[PDB]
Amino acid sequence: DWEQYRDRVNMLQQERIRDSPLLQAAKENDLRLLKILLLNDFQQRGAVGETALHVAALYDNLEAATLLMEAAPELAKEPALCEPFVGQTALHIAVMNQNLNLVRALLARGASVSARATGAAFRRSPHNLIYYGEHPLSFAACVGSEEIVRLLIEHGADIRAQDSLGNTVLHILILQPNKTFACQMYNLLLSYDEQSLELVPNHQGLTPFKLAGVEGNTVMFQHLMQKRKHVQWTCGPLTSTLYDLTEIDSWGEELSFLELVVSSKKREARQILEQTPVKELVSFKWKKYGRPYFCVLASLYILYMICFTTCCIYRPLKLRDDNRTDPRDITILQQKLLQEAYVTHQDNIRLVGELVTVTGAVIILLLEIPDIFRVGASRYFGQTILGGPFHVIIITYASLVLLTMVMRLTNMNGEVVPLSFALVLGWCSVMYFARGFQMLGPFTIMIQKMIFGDLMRFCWLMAVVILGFASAFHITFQTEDPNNLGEFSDYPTALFSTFELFLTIIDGPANYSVDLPFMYCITYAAFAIIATLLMLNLFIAMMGDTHWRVAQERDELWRAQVVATTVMLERKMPRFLWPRSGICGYEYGLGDRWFLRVENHH
Amino acid sequence: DWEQYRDRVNMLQQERIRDSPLLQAAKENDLRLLKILLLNDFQQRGAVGETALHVAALYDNLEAATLLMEAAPELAKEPALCEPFVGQTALHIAVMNQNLNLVRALLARGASVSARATGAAFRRSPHNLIYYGEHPLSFAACVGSEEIVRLLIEHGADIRAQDSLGNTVLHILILQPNKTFACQMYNLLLSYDEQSLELVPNHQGLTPFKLAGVEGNTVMFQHLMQKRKHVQWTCGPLTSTLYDLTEIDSWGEELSFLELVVSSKKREARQILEQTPVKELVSFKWKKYGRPYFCVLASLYILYMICFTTCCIYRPLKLRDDNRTDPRDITILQQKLLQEAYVTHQDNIRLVGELVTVTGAVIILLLEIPDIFRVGASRYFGQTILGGPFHVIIITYASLVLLTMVMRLTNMNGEVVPLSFALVLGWCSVMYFARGFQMLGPFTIMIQKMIFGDLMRFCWLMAVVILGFASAFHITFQTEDPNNLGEFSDYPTALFSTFELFLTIIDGPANYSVDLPFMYCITYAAFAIIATLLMLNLFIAMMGDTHWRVAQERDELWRAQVVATTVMLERKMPRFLWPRSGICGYEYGLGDRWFLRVENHH
Ligand SMILES: CCCCC/C=C/C/C=C\CCCCCCCC(=O)O[C@H](COC(=O)CCCCCCCCCCCCCCC)COP(=O)([O-])OCC[N+](C)(C)C
Ligand SMILES: CCCCC/C=C/C/C=C\CCCCCCCC(=O)O[C@H](COC(=O)CCCCCCCCCCCCCCC)COP(=O)([O-])OCC[N+](C)(C)C
Ligand SMILES: CC(C)[C@@H](C)/C=C/[C@@H](C)[C@H]1CC[C@H]2C3=CC=C4C[C@@H](O)CC[C@]4(C)[C@H]3CC[C@]12C
Ligand SMILES: CC(C)[C@@H](C)/C=C/[C@@H](C)[C@H]1CC[C@H]2C3=CC=C4C[C@@H](O)CC[C@]4(C)[C@H]3CC[C@]12C
Ligand SMILES: CC(C)[C@@H](C)/C=C/[C@@H](C)[C@H]1CC[C@H]2C3=CC=C4C[C@@H](O)CC[C@]4(C)[C@H]3CC[C@]12C
Ligand SMILES: CC(C)[C@@H](C)/C=C/[C@@H](C)[C@H]1CC[C@H]2C3=CC=C4C[C@@H](O)CC[C@]4(C)[C@H]3CC[C@]12C
Ligand SMILES: Clc1ccc(CO[C@H](Cn2ccnc2)c2ccc(Cl)cc2Cl)cc1
Ligand SMILES: Clc1ccc(CO[C@H](Cn2ccnc2)c2ccc(Cl)cc2Cl)cc1
């Protein structure tokens, strides 16, 4: 494992510092022994290929570092060599320790401001506690030392240099927790760039502005918006401001900023949607175009489900040919074959409803399947905000309809099976449209968070109780006449009856005309106390507890689903139905850009 | 009782101080009368055998104490004599009152720094509000007077002296509430020890470090860890530290530190498991070895319960020989005798499943019974963290299986009884394995805390309602025909029907074809309002209230169960499956010790 390897790397490194007396002196700063050793090799190297000068820089020993550089000036130019620390210089270490004096002493001796720490200890991963990129300027920026940043720029550090992820220093500053100085650092670096560095993409294709959206950095987003707004006027308490939508609206731009925010895995990303130009833009798009078109699609989908349902109610059946010789058999009707299922006027009316049913199932796969490939399947079905569980059950409904079409054509018996599943999944997928309505939308998120949370834990322990008691009830009744109490007459019936008795959906079995086993009254008293009294009421109690705790996130998730719907509809619908949002600059002399005017009170 | 005796001791002591004028003057500090009495016995003794100098020290009277010591210097050497205060000197009292001047005046006169207050007022018990051990140094330490501690050490107080419990002054400092100075006192005492006193066991076998674990003293534990860590390096925001696991991991050491913490009765002990080297160690042990092996044992136990269940579903039965002459009799099948229960191929397949069933029941007792003797039965079955209620029901299942084996061998009728109990308890004991899974584990603690809490109180008052109403319903129906409403036809049926009606698991009795008693509709209206409407919904309401209050402790108990599982698995499994945790020091030149490297951000 990685942690065991990193640990061994750290232990070997400290051992080699103990073993080699020059490295031991570089750690301890005992200038007497260090003078004797350098008076008496200087290119000696620790376990990771680091020099004695890396050791002196790591332990923050300015004097030992000057002695080492006086005896061997070339050490200031040396990288570390082994896989965790490849390319790390003493300048990366001195910058990270903020030793401005040692940074000057290294730069005065030819330490390379363009050296890149490509080793695995520096990369962005859950393995590493920090990500400062690869260059000393990116370290000084994330460490927050403006005086070291200037000093490195004055020695010719390339401010537009890129990490192995393609990240510039501006991208790396968006990723830091220290947001209180990261914005001050961002201004310092833009002052030396003076194509703008704000427009350089990383290897994901993200500019710094798009990365602040994806990562949910609302502090850096609202800082970046200060150079993308113009105050038109202020009059007493009122201000009118004009925000530039160019990056927010991302017109004709691959994945758009608003797609990148709503499809981000980072739970902070949904907070960008509350920021002034974004909130007013997505609110405008929803109220003017999104809600009207979502109410149309919701209405058309309900009429399509009424059409499919009617084709199941009027499903073609005939009187069975085979006699009911078994007294326990109740089947009286049978499927019509294709050559007899389409004869009357009503059969031709149903053929139209069935062809509409199949046409909608094809159209569902034509809408769904391409979006799997754009978003990636793991995120497409995974993300609550995009509709992930509804994309599973709508593709499953469409598949069950097209399966049933093949069964109808090949005279296959058993259409009740895929039609019963398609009727349940088809109607339950109408809850996809609940996200458009403030009344239904937050509640449909509780249904989801209770299904994959409390209902899941409950069903695991409920299943253990049902297996114990269904077995005790079955063996209690094995010796008794099945005609007098049938609920436990075989193991599959005993399981189903015990499940229905748990949820109190079937009455406890009794027959006062006969003597039931005494072991049944004992077993059912224990069952009624564990299943019905304790666990079925403890389900209500733990749902009530989950409900009050989750109620805020439920609302934040609902307002993010309305934005994700708005972004989906605008992407997928014809552009003539979605006129470009905001104010066109060109007819006011503002050039090709488009704007959002926000008027506000203070 | 103890309190009545202590009270009488205190009253007699004050009476003897009132009665004897030297003790009265030693209490009042009236130097005139005290001079006259000492000018005019001085070995006079209060009810507990204390001298006039103990009285002067108790009332903090420095002047009277100097007058008494000037007239009778030997009083500084005297103990108290009666059972509550045996061996207490005026030096113990003066140290507890922090009278540094009186402590010097006593030590200057030969007061014994090694005297031990062995009386019952000083011992560790719920009877006593303080436990300072027995020696004046242990008093001065717990009282927190560094100047009195030095003064006693300078007069030759043995710092390694032990209380009647075997506790040294270091053990006693772990037991004090005053943790804000107890650590400063701990350093002061280690400075005079300079075998280390940190390694001396008490009569429980606990070193001071193990006692901080058992007592849940997280402040003294994290203080003791400062001399059991080494900082390897710091580089900007990151530090790497190397903790010595020698006492935490307790390799080959009887009860190990981690056993002593998880099996402690003190509800604070589980907080030690959140401390940096312990949390990272038990997290490592769980993720690398504990969770894999617990998922294997959980899977093997579920397959064993499927095997046992199948042996009950395929249980050997034949058509009854005796006729159903009673019209209320429904038994049609009967046990096969041993000599006819094993004839077909399917009976020999079932004999393998039955021998697997019996083999697992023996193995359960071979695993369970020795652990009773290590932990002690009162704690083994009592502790939630160790699995106490599951150890009861798994030993009960194994006993019911071995009972059923004897019944099968001795042709005994009634195997339905122990098999129905073994099927319920056997399957419900699968919830033991819920502690390995973050989804199921905290919820299984709510099931336990609701069973022994809210379900218990509810069942006591529910039973009182059921006895009232089952009796009213039975006597209402005694005069009526049993064939028209059978639910209350005898008292045992009336109790069971009333219990099922309370929980609404059987529908209220009605028969619209006949006139029921008017007293039934009255009694059932009152029953439906008290049982179903009020109490069954008040159960849900009080469980919801318990749920939100207990939800934090439920999570702390779950994370302590994961550690207790980790500690159990490592103890009971073969050592080749559990490679020794942490980093071996020897291959890095650190000697025989083993370490945990923790890398952290600030
Ligand atoms: C999110 C939560 C997910 C939880 C999922 C768990 C679901 C468990 C529910 C039930 C599964 C079993 C369905 C019926 C199978 C037996 C039908 C049958 O064929 O029975 C028997 C044969 O087999 C058996 O003896 C059953 C053996 C016991 C199996 C119990 C289930 C095992 C797996 C359960 C899951 C384990 C983990 C649970 C959680 C820890 C057929 O005999 P008979 O009854 O026809 O006649 C009576 C007997 N003569 C023929 C002699 C007259
Ligand atoms: C955690 C909570 C724990 C709570 C535990 C409490 C459980 C109480 C539940 C019930 C226990 C009694 C079970 C049935 C016994 C009668 C069967 C029988 O034999 O009845 C009778 C004989 O006796 C009786 O008259 C019963 C007398 C009343 C006893 C009531 C229970 C007493 C103890 C209850 C607990 C006290 C404390 C409660 C809480 C404060 C048999 O007459 P018969 O009915 O056949 O015919 C009808 C009558 N001829 C024969 C004339 C036709
Ligand atoms: C025998 C068939 C009918 C069984 C297996 C069918 C299961 C269906 C009814 C279950 C499977 C998953 C369930 C499910 C998945 C996820 C969600 C999203 C949530 O925000 C609203 C409820 C909803 C929509 C529910 C509805 C009911 C579903 C669709
Ligand atoms: C309690 C939780 C775990 C939920 C999910 C499980 C419920 C179980 C008990 C239910 C779900 C579907 C049920 C079920 C499906 C279909 C049949 C076929 C029928 O001819 C006999 C009953 C039988 C065999 C029952 C057995 C009990 C089952 C398997
Ligand atoms: C007639 C028989 C079948 C009656 C008496 C049997 C009672 C059983 C079902 C009861 C007795 C004590 C109960 C019990 C004890 C303690 C715990 C630990 C808790 O964390 C989970 C539930 C669990 C596991 C429950 C399950 C149900 C048990 C085991
Ligand atoms: C309400 C709480 C206190 C729970 C624990 C108690 C329930 C009582 C009412 C239940 C538990 C088991 C039941 C019970 C066990 C078995 C039998 C034998 C049967 O031939 C007649 C009913 C009879 C006699 C009933 C009477 C009512 C009992 C004793
Ligand atoms: Cl689960 C679910 C999901 C979506 C709707 C859509 O709900 C709206 C009505 N509504 C409800 C609340 N506020 C408005 C609706 C109903 C019927 C028809 Cl035909 C069209 C529409 Cl638009 C209803 C349930
Ligand atoms: Cl009450 C109870 C206790 C333990 C399990 C063990 O649950 C796991 C599944 N699980 C559940 C949650 N997260 C994972 C499991 C199921 C079946 C089999 Cl055969 C093996 C295993 Cl490991 C299930 C109920």
PDB file of C-alpha atoms in Angstrom, chain A residues 1 3-4 6-8 10-15 18 27 58-59 93 96-97 129-130 132 452-453 456-458 460-461 464-465 467-469 471-472 474-476 478-482 484 491 504 506-508 512-516 518-525 528-529 532-535 537-538 540-542 545 548-549, chain B residues 232-238 240 242 284 288 309 312-313 315 317 324 326-328 330-334 416-417 419-421 423-424 427-428 430-431 434 439-440 443-444 446-447 450-451 455 458-459 462 486-487 493 496-497 499-500 503 505-507 536 539-540 543-544 547-548 551 583 587-590 597 599-601:
ATOM      1  CA  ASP A   1       0.000   0.000   0.000  1.00  0.00           C
ATOM      2  CA  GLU A   3       1.026   4.604   3.233  1.00  0.00           C
ATOM      3  CA  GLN A   4       3.379   1.686   4.062  1.00  0.00           C
ATOM      4  CA  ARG A   6       5.661   6.506   2.191  1.00  0.00           C
ATOM      5  CA  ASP A   7       6.336   5.455   5.791  1.00  0.00           C
ATOM      6  CA  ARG A   8       9.346   3.269   4.747  1.00  0.00           C
ATOM      7  CA  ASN A  10      10.464   8.518   5.645  1.00  0.00           C
ATOM      8  CA  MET A  11      12.217   5.945   7.898  1.00  0.00           C
ATOM      9  CA  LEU A  12      15.047   5.219   5.380  1.00  0.00           C
ATOM     10  CA  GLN A  13      15.496   8.977   4.835  1.00  0.00           C
ATOM     11  CA  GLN A  14      15.929   9.644   8.589  1.00  0.00           C
ATOM     12  CA  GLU A  15      18.236   6.575   8.927  1.00  0.00           C
ATOM     13  CA  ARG A  18      21.689   9.510  11.083  1.00  0.00           C
ATOM     14  CA  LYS A  27      20.202  18.436  10.401  1.00  0.00           C
ATOM     15  CA  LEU A  58      14.406  20.984   5.521  1.00  0.00           C
ATOM     16  CA  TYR A  59      15.606  21.560   9.103  1.00  0.00           C
ATOM     17  CA  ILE A  93      12.140  23.276   0.578  1.00  0.00           C
ATOM     18  CA  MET A  96       7.992  25.998   1.726  1.00  0.00           C
ATOM     19  CA  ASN A  97       9.758  26.767   5.061  1.00  0.00           C
ATOM     20  CA  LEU A 129      -2.047  16.520   2.394  1.00  0.00           C
ATOM     21  CA  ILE A 130      -1.027  19.527   0.178  1.00  0.00           C
ATOM     22  CA  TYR A 132       1.280  23.316  -4.414  1.00  0.00           C
ATOM     23  CA  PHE A 452     -30.754   4.819   0.206  1.00  0.00           C
ATOM     24  CA  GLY A 453     -30.360   5.659   3.949  1.00  0.00           C
ATOM     25  CA  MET A 456     -31.692   0.348   3.476  1.00  0.00           C
ATOM     26  CA  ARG A 457     -30.408  -0.104   7.084  1.00  0.00           C
ATOM     27  CA  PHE A 458     -33.906  -1.072   8.213  1.00  0.00           C
ATOM     28  CA  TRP A 460     -31.054  -5.410   6.387  1.00  0.00           C
ATOM     29  CA  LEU A 461     -32.083  -5.956  10.052  1.00  0.00           C
ATOM     30  CA  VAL A 464     -32.775 -11.048   9.748  1.00  0.00           C
ATOM     31  CA  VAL A 465     -35.915 -10.905  11.984  1.00  0.00           C
ATOM     32  CA  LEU A 467     -35.787 -15.207   8.443  1.00  0.00           C
ATOM     33  CA  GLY A 468     -35.757 -16.185  12.151  1.00  0.00           C
ATOM     34  CA  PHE A 469     -39.513 -15.911  12.676  1.00  0.00           C
ATOM     35  CA  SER A 471     -38.623 -20.435  10.055  1.00  0.00           C
ATOM     36  CA  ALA A 472     -40.037 -20.753  13.599  1.00  0.00           C
ATOM     37  CA  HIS A 474     -43.127 -22.738   9.408  1.00  0.00           C
ATOM     38  CA  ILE A 475     -41.767 -25.502  11.680  1.00  0.00           C
ATOM     39  CA  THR A 476     -44.494 -24.769  14.280  1.00  0.00           C
ATOM     40  CA  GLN A 478     -45.463 -28.360   9.672  1.00  0.00           C
ATOM     41  CA  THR A 479     -47.262 -30.880  11.971  1.00  0.00           C
ATOM     42  CA  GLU A 480     -50.702 -29.175  11.616  1.00  0.00           C
ATOM     43  CA  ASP A 481     -53.411 -29.323   8.895  1.00  0.00           C
ATOM     44  CA  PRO A 482     -52.732 -26.697   6.105  1.00  0.00           C
ATOM     45  CA  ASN A 484     -57.025 -24.717   9.037  1.00  0.00           C
ATOM     46  CA  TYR A 491     -41.473 -21.931   3.468  1.00  0.00           C
ATOM     47  CA  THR A 504     -49.015  -5.365   9.769  1.00  0.00           C
ATOM     48  CA  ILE A 506     -52.169  -9.007   6.968  1.00  0.00           C
ATOM     49  CA  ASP A 507     -53.954  -9.831  10.271  1.00  0.00           C
ATOM     50  CA  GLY A 508     -52.217 -12.200  12.708  1.00  0.00           C
ATOM     51  CA  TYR A 512     -60.933 -19.915  17.154  1.00  0.00           C
ATOM     52  CA  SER A 513     -62.668 -23.122  15.893  1.00  0.00           C
ATOM     53  CA  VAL A 514     -59.373 -25.162  16.374  1.00  0.00           C
ATOM     54  CA  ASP A 515     -56.431 -25.581  18.803  1.00  0.00           C
ATOM     55  CA  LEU A 516     -53.329 -23.924  17.299  1.00  0.00           C
ATOM     56  CA  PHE A 518     -48.987 -23.294  22.045  1.00  0.00           C
ATOM     57  CA  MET A 519     -45.553 -22.539  20.508  1.00  0.00           C
ATOM     58  CA  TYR A 520     -47.323 -20.278  17.952  1.00  0.00           C
ATOM     59  CA  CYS A 521     -48.797 -17.949  20.580  1.00  0.00           C
ATOM     60  CA  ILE A 522     -45.332 -17.731  22.269  1.00  0.00           C
ATOM     61  CA  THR A 523     -43.505 -17.133  18.929  1.00  0.00           C
ATOM     62  CA  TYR A 524     -46.119 -14.588  17.712  1.00  0.00           C
ATOM     63  CA  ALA A 525     -46.056 -12.661  21.039  1.00  0.00           C
ATOM     64  CA  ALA A 528     -45.316  -8.778  17.653  1.00  0.00           C
ATOM     65  CA  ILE A 529     -43.084  -7.121  20.323  1.00  0.00           C
ATOM     66  CA  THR A 532     -44.509  -4.490  15.092  1.00  0.00           C
ATOM     67  CA  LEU A 533     -44.067  -2.795  18.494  1.00  0.00           C
ATOM     68  CA  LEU A 534     -40.278  -2.153  18.587  1.00  0.00           C
ATOM     69  CA  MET A 535     -38.850  -2.069  15.046  1.00  0.00           C
ATOM     70  CA  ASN A 537     -42.129   2.245  15.391  1.00  0.00           C
ATOM     71  CA  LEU A 538     -38.319   2.696  15.660  1.00  0.00           C
ATOM     72  CA  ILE A 540     -40.704   6.156  12.310  1.00  0.00           C
ATOM     73  CA  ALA A 541     -38.509   7.469  15.168  1.00  0.00           C
ATOM     74  CA  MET A 542     -35.247   7.244  13.146  1.00  0.00           C
ATOM     75  CA  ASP A 545     -34.508  12.158  13.448  1.00  0.00           C
ATOM     76  CA  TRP A 548     -34.860  17.339  10.882  1.00  0.00           C
ATOM     77  CA  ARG A 549     -31.114  16.876  10.317  1.00  0.00           C
TER      78      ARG A 549
ATOM     79  CA  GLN B 232      11.039  13.555  12.427  1.00  0.00           C
ATOM     80  CA  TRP B 233      10.612  16.780  10.383  1.00  0.00           C
ATOM     81  CA  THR B 234       8.418  19.841   9.768  1.00  0.00           C
ATOM     82  CA  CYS B 235       8.225  21.385   6.269  1.00  0.00           C
ATOM     83  CA  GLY B 236       5.943  24.418   5.858  1.00  0.00           C
ATOM     84  CA  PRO B 237       2.444  23.307   7.089  1.00  0.00           C
ATOM     85  CA  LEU B 238       3.344  19.566   7.325  1.00  0.00           C
ATOM     86  CA  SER B 240       5.894  13.973  10.400  1.00  0.00           C
ATOM     87  CA  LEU B 242       6.856   8.957  15.081  1.00  0.00           C
ATOM     88  CA  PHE B 284      -5.178   0.784  10.457  1.00  0.00           C
ATOM     89  CA  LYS B 288      -6.258  -3.824   6.781  1.00  0.00           C
ATOM     90  CA  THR B 309     -32.547 -23.464   8.852  1.00  0.00           C
ATOM     91  CA  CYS B 312     -35.459 -27.466  10.241  1.00  0.00           C
ATOM     92  CA  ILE B 313     -37.360 -27.043   6.900  1.00  0.00           C
ATOM     93  CA  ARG B 315     -37.058 -31.967   9.596  1.00  0.00           C
ATOM     94  CA  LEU B 317     -41.979 -36.118  10.052  1.00  0.00           C
ATOM     95  CA  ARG B 324     -58.274 -36.800  15.287  1.00  0.00           C
ATOM     96  CA  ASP B 326     -61.480 -34.145  18.988  1.00  0.00           C
ATOM     97  CA  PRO B 327     -63.070 -31.870  16.272  1.00  0.00           C
ATOM     98  CA  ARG B 328     -60.780 -28.967  17.408  1.00  0.00           C
ATOM     99  CA  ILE B 330     -55.522 -30.126  13.603  1.00  0.00           C
ATOM    100  CA  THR B 331     -52.301 -32.167  14.096  1.00  0.00           C
ATOM    101  CA  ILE B 332     -51.740 -34.508  11.088  1.00  0.00           C
ATOM    102  CA  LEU B 333     -47.947 -35.176  11.191  1.00  0.00           C
ATOM    103  CA  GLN B 334     -45.690 -36.556  13.957  1.00  0.00           C
ATOM    104  CA  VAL B 416     -40.505 -27.785  17.699  1.00  0.00           C
ATOM    105  CA  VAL B 417     -39.943 -26.038  21.077  1.00  0.00           C
ATOM    106  CA  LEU B 419     -35.868 -25.483  17.362  1.00  0.00           C
ATOM    107  CA  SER B 420     -38.338 -22.529  17.258  1.00  0.00           C
ATOM    108  CA  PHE B 421     -36.296 -20.745  19.959  1.00  0.00           C
ATOM    109  CA  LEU B 423     -34.261 -20.374  14.847  1.00  0.00           C
ATOM    110  CA  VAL B 424     -35.293 -17.009  16.388  1.00  0.00           C
ATOM    111  CA  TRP B 427     -31.000 -15.596  13.197  1.00  0.00           C
ATOM    112  CA  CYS B 428     -31.292 -12.596  15.595  1.00  0.00           C
ATOM    113  CA  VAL B 430     -26.638 -12.418  12.982  1.00  0.00           C
ATOM    114  CA  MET B 431     -27.119  -8.810  14.227  1.00  0.00           C
ATOM    115  CA  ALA B 434     -23.917  -5.416  12.229  1.00  0.00           C
ATOM    116  CA  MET B 439     -24.809   1.625   7.935  1.00  0.00           C
ATOM    117  CA  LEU B 440     -26.112  -1.122  10.325  1.00  0.00           C
ATOM    118  CA  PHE B 443     -28.807   1.387  14.301  1.00  0.00           C
ATOM    119  CA  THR B 444     -28.181  -1.954  16.118  1.00  0.00           C
ATOM    120  CA  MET B 446     -30.499   2.030  18.979  1.00  0.00           C
ATOM    121  CA  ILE B 447     -32.333  -1.355  18.858  1.00  0.00           C
ATOM    122  CA  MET B 450     -34.700   1.058  22.905  1.00  0.00           C
ATOM    123  CA  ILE B 451     -35.185  -2.600  24.079  1.00  0.00           C
ATOM    124  CA  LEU B 455     -39.711  -0.959  25.259  1.00  0.00           C
ATOM    125  CA  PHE B 458     -43.776   0.568  27.855  1.00  0.00           C
ATOM    126  CA  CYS B 459     -44.260  -3.190  28.409  1.00  0.00           C
ATOM    127  CA  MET B 462     -48.986  -1.996  28.632  1.00  0.00           C
ATOM    128  CA  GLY B 486     -64.307 -16.742  20.060  1.00  0.00           C
ATOM    129  CA  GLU B 487     -61.614 -14.067  20.789  1.00  0.00           C
ATOM    130  CA  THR B 493     -57.322 -16.512  24.728  1.00  0.00           C
ATOM    131  CA  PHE B 496     -53.644 -13.025  23.855  1.00  0.00           C
ATOM    132  CA  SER B 497     -56.498 -11.397  21.861  1.00  0.00           C
ATOM    133  CA  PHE B 499     -52.481  -8.101  23.481  1.00  0.00           C
ATOM    134  CA  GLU B 500     -53.042  -8.472  19.679  1.00  0.00           C
ATOM    135  CA  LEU B 503     -50.915  -3.615  18.998  1.00  0.00           C
ATOM    136  CA  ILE B 505     -52.370  -6.963  14.830  1.00  0.00           C
ATOM    137  CA  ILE B 506     -55.892  -8.578  14.910  1.00  0.00           C
ATOM    138  CA  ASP B 507     -59.094  -6.715  13.884  1.00  0.00           C
ATOM    139  CA  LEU B 536     -49.349   2.957  20.969  1.00  0.00           C
ATOM    140  CA  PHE B 539     -44.612   4.884  22.253  1.00  0.00           C
ATOM    141  CA  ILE B 540     -43.650   6.406  18.848  1.00  0.00           C
ATOM    142  CA  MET B 543     -38.958   6.758  20.994  1.00  0.00           C
ATOM    143  CA  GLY B 544     -38.550   9.853  18.738  1.00  0.00           C
ATOM    144  CA  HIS B 547     -33.698   8.911  19.448  1.00  0.00           C
ATOM    145  CA  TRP B 548     -32.539  12.548  19.070  1.00  0.00           C
ATOM    146  CA  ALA B 551     -27.933   9.756  18.685  1.00  0.00           C
ATOM    147  CA  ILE B 583       6.905   0.118  11.839  1.00  0.00           C
ATOM    148  CA  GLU B 587      15.780  -2.324  10.566  1.00  0.00           C
ATOM    149  CA  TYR B 588      16.217   1.516  10.972  1.00  0.00           C
ATOM    150  CA  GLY B 589      18.571   1.323  14.031  1.00  0.00           C
ATOM    151  CA  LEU B 590      15.838   2.373  16.563  1.00  0.00           C
ATOM    152  CA  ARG B 597       4.382   7.447  11.832  1.00  0.00           C
ATOM    153  CA  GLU B 599       1.948  12.938   9.087  1.00  0.00           C
ATOM    154  CA  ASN B 600      -0.281  15.979   9.820  1.00  0.00           C
ATOM    155  CA  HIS B 601      -1.195  19.524   8.617  1.00  0.00           C
TER     156      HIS B 601
END
